[PDB]
Design a protein around this ligand. Sequence first.
Ligand SMILES: OC[C@H]1O[C@@](CO)(O[C@H]2O[C@H](CO)[C@@H](O)[C@H](O)[C@H]2O)[C@@H](O)[C@@H]1O
Ligand SMILES: [Cl-]
Length: 404
Amino acid sequence: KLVNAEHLDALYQKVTVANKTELGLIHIYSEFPDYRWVKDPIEGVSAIDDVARAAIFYQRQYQATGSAADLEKVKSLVEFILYQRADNGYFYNFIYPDHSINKEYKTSVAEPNWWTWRALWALTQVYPTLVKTDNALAQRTRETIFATIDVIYKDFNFKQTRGEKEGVAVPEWLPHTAGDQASVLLMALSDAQALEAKPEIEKMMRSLAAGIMLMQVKDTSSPVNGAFLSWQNLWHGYGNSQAYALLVAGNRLGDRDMIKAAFNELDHFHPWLISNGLLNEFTVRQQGEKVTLIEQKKFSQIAYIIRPMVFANIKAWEISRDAVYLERAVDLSLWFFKNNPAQAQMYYPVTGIAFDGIDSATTVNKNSGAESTIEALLTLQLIESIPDAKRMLESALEKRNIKQ
Ligand SMILES: OC[C@H]1O[C@@](CO)(O[C@H]2O[C@H](CO)[C@@H](O)[C@H](O)[C@H]2O)[C@@H](O)[C@@H]1O
Ligand SMILES: [Cl-]
């Protein structure tokens, strides 16, 4: 009842190219008040960054409901992902309005980047669904998963050298030295390891987790004790799925250290964030063992901050059976329902609209692009799948002045 795919469905478009190749697109932007399709004028109409996450949403919907229409969307979004595979084994990101591929723009080249990791994660997430339903598409997907992993393995830097920024160690072997990108590649590799275990996949998993863990703040005197930094000495909330990824990988490998590191973020940094109304980003300085805040930015706040935290807390509950994590997951979900600095409703169950962000205490961006819609839907979809969390969120919503 909370989850309403009507706006995401309106961003979806099936296009035919070449010889009966049917591609599922998700239009990237959509603007208040008419909420039609809006493009990026330079980059194109739809990106793997969004299509990949949409594929996961619709696959999870199909798993919950068995709806033939959800499955059809999974298949066509997967076709777009496969359509974007480059000869070198990486992926292009954008498609243009004329349905040619954006191969050369910096946000779209087939080089290791965010959209590679998201594409791979989407393919590993939807493969078990495809193998039960569509033999030919499943075979192509499996071939692509492990061919892409081959390429990533061939290019992988296992030499664990460290830089430094404001006293903080930098793992030079992570992609773009980015803990957030590393977490999604780690999630994808963990899924693939369950499909076909390979020593080189475990080796990459452990190397990524080592880099992610080196970037964690471990200073019990620091306000942001437990935080997984995103890049150098910087944390940003968006896409920061390190804790969730370490829980997934730690479970896959039986690695207690990974699990312990993830809980350290959940048990210290998450309650701090929640108590302070969330943040967009911050930077730190490290002097010896002491980690201190340099600067922080409360805005902008976007749906993509909430989803990684809700994913991690639900997973923590599943592992530990501690209800505090469900309570926190629900309290974080309330960001969509006016628990935020603008006291603004950010997701509308009646229409499926998800606002694009909070820019200050008094300014809300009422556009509803693909990313914010998918991230709100994935968050609420997870809550509604856990009966105790669903019951808790419904109880919180009956008491407040939201539109539903
Ligand atoms: O502008 C295109 C596209 O960008 C987004 C990203 O969230 O919004 C940006 O641009 C808006 C005006 O064009 C600004 O008001 C907003 O602050 C900025 O984030 C989408 O909302 C929009 O569709
Ligand atoms: Cl992601």
